[PDB]
Every structure is written in C-alpha cells, then in structure tokens.
Design an enzyme around this catalytic site. Sequence first.
Site, PDB file in Angstrom:
ATOM      1  N   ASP A 145      16.197  23.261  13.559  1.00 35.34           N
ATOM      2  CA  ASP A 145      15.836  24.373  12.868  1.00 35.34           C
ATOM      3  C   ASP A 145      16.478  25.754  13.078  1.00 35.34           C
ATOM      4  O   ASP A 145      16.743  25.858  14.114  1.00 35.34           O
ATOM      5  CB  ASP A 145      14.438  24.285  12.883  1.00 35.34           C
ATOM      6  CG  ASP A 145      13.652  25.088  11.810  1.00 35.34           C
ATOM      7  OD1 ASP A 145      14.006  25.330  10.755  1.00 35.34           O
ATOM      8  OD2 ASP A 145      12.503  25.717  12.213  1.00 35.34           O
ATOM      9  N   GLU A 183      19.183  23.205   9.849  1.00 33.80           N
ATOM     10  CA  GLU A 183      18.716  23.790   8.678  1.00 33.80           C
ATOM     11  C   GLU A 183      19.552  25.098   8.161  1.00 33.80           C
ATOM     12  O   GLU A 183      19.841  25.679   8.762  1.00 33.80           O
ATOM     13  CB  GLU A 183      17.149  24.397   8.997  1.00 33.80           C
ATOM     14  CG  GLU A 183      16.482  25.023   7.854  1.00 33.80           C
ATOM     15  CD  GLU A 183      15.362  26.122   8.025  1.00 33.80           C
ATOM     16  OE1 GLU A 183      14.191  25.725   7.529  1.00 33.80           O
ATOM     17  OE2 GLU A 183      15.706  27.046   8.618  1.00 33.80           O
TER      18      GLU A 183
END
EC number: 3.2.1.135
Lengths: 594, 594
Positions: free
Chosen positions: A308, A337
């Site tokens: 992330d 991400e």
Amino acid sequence: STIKKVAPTFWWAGMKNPELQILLYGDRISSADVSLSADNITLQEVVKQENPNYLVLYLDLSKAAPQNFDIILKQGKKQTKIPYELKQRRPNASAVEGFDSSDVLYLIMPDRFANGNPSNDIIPGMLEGNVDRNEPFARHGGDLKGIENHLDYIADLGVTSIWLNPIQENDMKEGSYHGYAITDYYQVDRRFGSNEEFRKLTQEANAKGLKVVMDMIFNHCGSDNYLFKDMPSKDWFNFEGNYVQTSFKTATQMDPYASDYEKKIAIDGWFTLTMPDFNQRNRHVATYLIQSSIWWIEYAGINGIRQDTHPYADFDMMARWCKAVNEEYPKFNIVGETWLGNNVLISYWQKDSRLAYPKNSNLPTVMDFPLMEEMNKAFDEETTEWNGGLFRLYEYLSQDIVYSHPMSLLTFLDNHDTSRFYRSEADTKNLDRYKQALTFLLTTRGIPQIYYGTEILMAADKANGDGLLRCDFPGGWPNDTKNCFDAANRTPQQNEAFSFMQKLLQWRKGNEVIAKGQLKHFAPNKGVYVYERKYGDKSVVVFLNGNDREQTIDLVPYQEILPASSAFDLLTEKKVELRNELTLPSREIYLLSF
Amino acid sequence: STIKKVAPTFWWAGMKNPELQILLYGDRISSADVSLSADNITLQEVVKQENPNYLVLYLDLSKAAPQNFDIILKQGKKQTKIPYELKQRRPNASAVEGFDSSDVLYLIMPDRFANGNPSNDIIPGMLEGNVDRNEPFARHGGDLKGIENHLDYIADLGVTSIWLNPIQENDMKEGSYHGYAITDYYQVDRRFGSNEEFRKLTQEANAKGLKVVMDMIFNHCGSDNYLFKDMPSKDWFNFEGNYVQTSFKTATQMDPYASDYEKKIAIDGWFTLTMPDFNQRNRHVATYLIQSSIWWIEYAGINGIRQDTHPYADFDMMARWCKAVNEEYPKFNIVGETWLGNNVLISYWQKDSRLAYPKNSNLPTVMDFPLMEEMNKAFDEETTEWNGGLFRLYEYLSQDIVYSHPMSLLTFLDNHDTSRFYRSEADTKNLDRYKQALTFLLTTRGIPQIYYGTEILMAADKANGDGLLRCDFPGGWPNDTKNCFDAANRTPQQNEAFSFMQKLLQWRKGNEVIAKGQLKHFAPNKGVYVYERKYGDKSVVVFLNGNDREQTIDLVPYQEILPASSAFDLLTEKKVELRNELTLPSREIYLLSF
Ligand SMILES: [Ca+2]
Ligand SMILES: [Ca+2]
Ligand SMILES: [Ca+2]
Ligand SMILES: [Ca+2]
C-alpha cells in the site's frame, strides 16, 4: 529482562542475502559491549544512535548453518544473554509460486469477515479495549480463525487466492480495526490471532488450492509503534520526526514540471498525525522493513504482497526492495497501490516502464484504478454509435501500449477504499450491470480481484464514510440472523448473484485461454462490444450488448474470431447461431468457446 | 494538344533527392514512345497502367543543371513535344526556417476571412458557380488578395505566422468552400487566386515578419480530381476504387488488441463518398503526393505544413514523407492532425515516440486536442481543494512524460472543426475565461495557435453545423456594416478582448523565456494555479485564481520561483507584493517577470 524487543524475532540460514540486521530495544543498552557466542557467524558492526535504548547489529551469515546462538551484552557488572535462532529453511522455499493472471484474488478485511474466536475480541493491555459492531469505525471482532472457518466457502466460490488487509498488529487508541497503522511489524494483531495461527491459515488455504496475499505498509507505521514512540533517531522519520501533512500529490515523483517544495511535502509528508512517515533513505529503516517482508514470506509461505502507499515512498528504496524480494523468491509477485488518475502515471511505476526508462521500479504488478473508474460507468450508460457505455472499455484498453506488462495489472470493480460496485442496497435490484461487469472483468486482460461480499450484493457508498465500506459479512458472527455463507439463508437475488460469479470463476480457474491468451476486441457495433481471448487454437469470445434494448448486428466484422457457425454460451448453456446476423436481447451476454 | 495535365508543372535542379516523377495525362497516350531532348537527364523508366490516358515517367536529375527541355511522345505519325523547365533554386532554399514554440500561428479559412477581389468569386466553368454569404455551406468569396490586404492587421495583432486551411483547388459541385476535397494538387483554387498570388502573399507576409503554414491532405482527394474521375488504375485508391465508409477508428494503427477487419475499414476506408481514399502504398501515388508537398515548399517559401488526417494514412509512407521533407529542408516543421481522445495515442504519432519504438513516425509536431478539451472546461469550473477547474491543467501537464517532444505540441482553444472558445454571442459577456485561457495558452509549454476571429469574440457552437464555425470576418467584405479590422468600428468588449490578446502576443514575440524555458508548476493552492517559465536567469511567473472569489494564499510554497519581494504584472502594469501572503481578487491573473 533489560531487553524489551528483538527484531527480527528469528532468521534462517542460507538466505540469498547473507546479511542480517538485528535491532535490539531495551533500557539504556547502547553503551553495552556486544559479542556473539555462535558457530561461523561474524558480527560485522554495532551501530549506536542518539537514543540509548537501541542497538543495531549487522551479522554476516554466509558461512553459517542452522543453529541456536547467543547475543551477549556486557555492561560493567551486568551481563545479558539474548538467545537467537537461525532456523533451517523448508526445501524449495525459494520456489514458492507467486500469483498471476491465472489467479483471481479475494480481498478480505479480517476484522469484518468472520469472528471464529470471540475470546480475542478484547485483549487486556491493548489501548483499544472495546468492540462495538454498531460503530462503523470500531473493532467488530473478526479474526483469522473466522477466515479459516470459511475457507470452504471461499474455495467453492471459485477464487484462487485470499488477499488480506494488514494483519500486523495495530495497537492504537482509535482506528485500529483497518490495520494501516502498524505498531509491530513482527506480530500478528493479538485480536486476530498469533503468528502460528497465520501460518496455519496459510497451510489450510494452500491445501484447499488457495494462495495467500498479504498487505504491508512501508510508507508509515502507527504513532504507537515503539520505533516511533521511542525513536532510535530523528532520521528514522521524515521532517525529523515532526508532523507535516502530505499533499497526497504523488505525481511529483515523475511530473517533469514538479517543484522541489511539492516533491518534499508529498513524499516526505505524513498521511495523518498518527501515521508518521518512515524515512526509507535511512539504511537501518530500509533493511528493517525489507527484512520484515522477507520474514513473512519465509515464515508463512505467502504467495504475494500488496505494498500500500507504494508511490508515497522513496522510489530508489522501493526498487531495491522489489529486487531483493525477487532475488530470494524469483516467482513471487508484488503489487503496488498506484492510485493515480491515469494510465500514464501508473505505467511509470510498473517494472520495465518505457516512460520511466532508464529508471526501473522493478515492481511487477500495479493497480488499474482507471479501469475501475471506467467499469463503474461503462455498464450503466447508453452505448451510442460514437461514444458512451462500453466505448469506455474499448477506448481505455486501446491505450495499453503505455503499460509494459498489461497481464500484470490488478483489475477490480472496487475495494476497501472505494464505494462498492453497488452504492446502495436499492441499486442491487437490477443485476444486469453486475453480470456484464463481472463477465468483462473475468475474461479481459489482467489479474482480477473480488472484494469480499461482492458475491452477495453487499452495498456501500464512499459518502457515508469508510467504516460502512467494510461491513460485517452477514454470517461471520455467531449471533447473526441470516448466515449468507450458506445458500439456504440467502435472498433469491443474492443466490442469483453468487451463482453467476461462481460459474465464471469456476470456469476461469485452470483456463489457459484467459490466463495466457492474446486479446482482440472490436469497437462497439450498434452498442455491442465484442472481443476474443485466444491461446494456440483454443479461443473464447464475449458479446456484451451495451444497451437496454434488442439489437441485431452484422457478424461479418467478426469473421476472423468466429471459426464455426455456432457455439454454446457457457452461462445459459444455450446454443448461439453465428451466421450473418445476430439478435441480442436487452443487456445480453454471450460467452462462447471454440 | 493531346496533353491535358502535366505534374509537377515544373521542377528544380539540385534537389537532394535527384529523382523526378513526371505524370502525364492525355488522350490514349500510354502506347507512345517516349524520349527526352535534354542536357544530362536520364529517362530511367516509363510506367504504363490499365488506363491508357496516363504515362508515369521517372527521370534522374543527379547530373543536371537548370535548363528547358522537351519530353517527346511519338505515336505512329503523330509527335507531341511537351516542354519542361528545371528552374534554378534560390540560394539557401534548403535553409528555410520552420516554426516552433517561439511562434504563434493564426489559423485562417481563406473563403471566410476577406474578399479582396470580388471578380474571382465566380469562375466560369467551375462546377460550383454560386456564392451566397447567407448560406453557411456555400462559397462566400474570400481570397488571397483579402489576406494580403490585411497582413498589417495580422502582424499588429502580434502573431508570428499565418496558417491557411487548404488553398489547393476544390473544383467540386458542393462543399468546395472548405478546401478538403482537392481536385488539383498543383493549382491554387482559381476563386482564391493564382499560384503567383500565393507566392506574393508569402513574400508580403515574410516582409512583415510573418511565417506561412499550409494545410495539405494526402489521405484523400475530391471525387472530381482527374486522378480519381479518370483513375490511372484501381490500385491508386483503396478498396479498388469502390466506396467503403471509414469507421474513423484510427486507434487501430496502434491498439495492441486491434482486429484485421477494423484496421482495414479505418485506414483504407473513405471519409465520405466525394473524398476517396488514396492508396499511399502505391509507389506512384506516394511520390506524386510527396513531390507535391516539396513543390509548394520550393515554389512558395512556406515555413510549415499541417497534414490533416495524418492518422488515416499509411504509417510507413507518412514516415517516409516526413523524412524526405526534412532531408530537403532540415529546419522545416510538419504538424500532423492527431485527433484522438488521449495523450497516449497522440504520443505514438510524434517523432521518437517511446511507445511507438522501434517504429518512428518522424513527425515533429502533433496536435494537443486533449489539452484543448481540458482548457474548454478548466476556466469555467470551481477549483476546489482536491479537483476541478485549474486542476485539469495541473493533472494533464504532469502526464507530459508520455510525449517525446512537449515543446513541439500544437496547443489551441479551438479550430475550424470545433465549437469556438465561446459557443454563443451571449457567452462573450464575460471575458474572465478568455483572459485566463489565453494567459495560460501563451505562457505554458507548446506552440500556440489562434483561430481567426478569436481576438474579436466571434462565437459558434458545433451543434449548429460546421458552416457557422467559419463565419465571415466582419470587415472582410466591401459591404459589411462594421469593419472589425479597425478599432474604431469595434464594440468596447471586442476592443478589450483584442487589446488583451495583443498585449500577450506582442510580449511573447522574441521572448526567449516562453520560447525555450523550462516549465515548473504547483498544484492549485486554495484554487490558485501558479507556474514558472525559466531560461538561464530570466524567468516569468503566472498566477491564475481558479475561482469567482477573493483568496489569500501562503507564498511559502513558491519561494523557489520568487527571487524578489515584488514584481510588475505585465497586464495591468501594477506592482505585486511577494511577501509571505498574497490576496487575489476574483479570477485574478498576474504575469510577473524576473
Ligand atoms: Ca474474534
Ligand atoms: Ca513517505
Ligand atoms: Ca473574391
Ligand atoms: Ca486512408
């Protein structure tokens, strides 16, 4: 004793990288004289920093076999023995499979899927001592045991992999439920399970034919992480440990017109006050985090990581990270991400990017957020002669020259940070869009991901806050009225939805055409989008009628993908005649094999 | 005689490419025995084709000096002498300047700008024998003399170049006014002028410091072109001379998922019935067209060509064309119409495209239609904290890594194929958007183009048809009531608009900062977009307030582009204080120098 924390907890002999950083945390330990009692291990270096509660040790393990050994701190009269294990690697640990376009990932927020052990919903000593299933932003009590209890359901649905939101411990006062503020990188959150429980979950998943992917976060930790609360030094976190709020403008990494001021604010800025920004340019921070990822791969047997916040981190260090992971596990897949508005900026983050060259992220998989935006409108609009509806898909895909590895793009209708595919319960009354969207997703290029609950029409709108994006799976709690893990307790519509996704998923699993085949598509023809996946001589052909009406179309355009005068639709198991013209009912879907 | 048409009309000695194709058209000439009476010219080849009305001659001119010579056709008893001139090149013809980001182009539709000779409004024998200024789709009588009459106005406006819609003859029954259906590639339309008039126009323009750019069309000719009406062979036009309508789907050239069927329909398909599609894969067609472009460069002294419809033509031949032009004129600039929805597909057509590699279009300049779409919304919307308005500009520009040569992108608010910047006369009541849009256009990266009449608030909406996109410049006709070429006859608002554009243009001319400088920009700050152009130590800084309200902003972000505590706004000639904070009135614009 005087030693509060040891990282990593333990290591292995015979890793490709023979260096081991051991981080020691305790009471004024930094003045200690350090030695080892071990067999063929060299203590290369002991690093002291402003904070006297830490020592950083660098060991060379190149000549070392599995063993138990001791780290020894001598301070005046006091002597502390810290035991440490070099485990022996499973055979073929290096050769763990990754995930790829043959897979479909099922994304689960652990606290919100299933409560299989209520006794761990509250853990004495943890700062957030409350559970409240009626508060969207509070812990609800989901756990690993809960996922383990329902592996049968997940496998039967037809997905090939579970992907977990972060399971590393979030010992925070508020907001601990979601996992994105880690306080210990080497411990599963005690409210989810122990480390061993995670290993068991993985074993259990693998035995039912499921891969496991794990979310990790290097950009930031929670403000209650010992590394932050009691910083080794000001250099471990950006802005010298002082809160400066990020702009979220991550385009500054690649924007040719970026300012110095804005690059710093974005990439060194903190996501919030309680999520301080790691300085990945610090050698100790970087190795600490890198090792943490490798640890979980060796220990738990995972097949994948999603990093992330990848674009909010130092570019060079994240390239080193991907390289170091792939050097140890050559088939392993990492997805970053890449939450940006367009394919151009996303493509920069993908390994072998033509637009980043000569820079290279080494990041195999990135996330196709733009495709998500298009898919959330493409099935609701009219598809005219010129534009709208399914044109969004035609037009977006034709831009795939930007992407270096189009089959390593994660594709998805939604996730835990977006409105769900269906924004409200009321919208789920019509399943046309669901059927077209999922047919598209599971036949076109890329690596599909399904968010938990999609298959039973869970609905949510971003405007009502993030907590309601992540509602409890109905059935995951002992006291739930309707247990949707079983068909018997599902609405008719829920079963229509579930059965449809399952048909596609079960058919997709093992299917080499979808996993490896070329893609060829045609401009919408009187509203009807048509495309082919083709591997060797086997092929698949999709027709999607992009309007709420009957349409007859000429089939002459598609001669080159229609090698026979008829075929069977996989969905209705009915025959479709391929001769000169074809009449398609409102929102028809055909999925033909040849 | 028996010879109706000779192409090219004449040639030059000492061109870099020593080959000359001479195309002969007449009555059953193809059986003739061909020879030359000349000094050091070799007749290499005589090509015969299905149609007996044509001969194609290939001459080698490598050893040849300027001269008059004869082509000789002997058929039985009959003998035809065709005289032919090899002119002597102006010195330094090769070294003609191109155009570039130091320029601003002024786009003129000749039939609709000025009528300087009414006697040529109707030409005996031409199929369209009518003028009707009250019919949007009819000829109105504009001509070259009209442009020549108003060069003073154009130069005074501050632009550096005139760009003409096609001036090559369109002898068609209907629709001849716009120029995009050429019936003779070697003749100016007799309703506009003679060839000599065009050369004179160019001379006159150059002497007032103006470059000239010319539209050309290789994709198609008009159905009344002799080459089509009386085809040399079926191979000269696609679909063997039979009308098949193009899809307009030009993404098929680069789409990795394109079908064979769709590529053919798009690139070999005809634009309409009366615009048949040249087969550029035919060697004779290609040389014919290539030579035509070079002819007009040598003959008229133009600085630039815009190739309309560039993506509808064969990729390989258009790359050969650009190469052949640049081999003869190394500084010459060619812009291709790249009318596509996104920067990715447009970037493919630009020379040295990273996404086309190893293919290379050799096309120096392409058209930034996406920037146009954004600019037509960016000045009307609210610029919030996160999105809207001037964010469209920030976000679009940050994607410039896709483009190989961002300073060779033609930028524009509108053109003869779009709604004008102002859609209706009523919208022109507010000039805020005009002032911000033009400030942006004339200071940011690229090569600006102004469409004629923008400077006096001519308005038009695509929905009312193309004819009203190209209204008569008020003043270009002897009987017009208000002559807007002079300030005295202009509305106050028209003069506000004209004076604003002129200030910017006059300042931009010669300005090395805008022409060659780096660009650096900042995310909208409480609605205010800020950016810098910088060359060596001279710089320019723009502030655009993206809202209909007063806003105070922190100036600390911009320290790196504000080298002094104050500067003078070029527009109002008033001082702006650069210390800690700045308050910007509704829709403020500052254009600072340092
Ligand atoms: Ca629990
Ligand atoms: Ca960061
Ligand atoms: Ca005239
Ligand atoms: Ca064509």
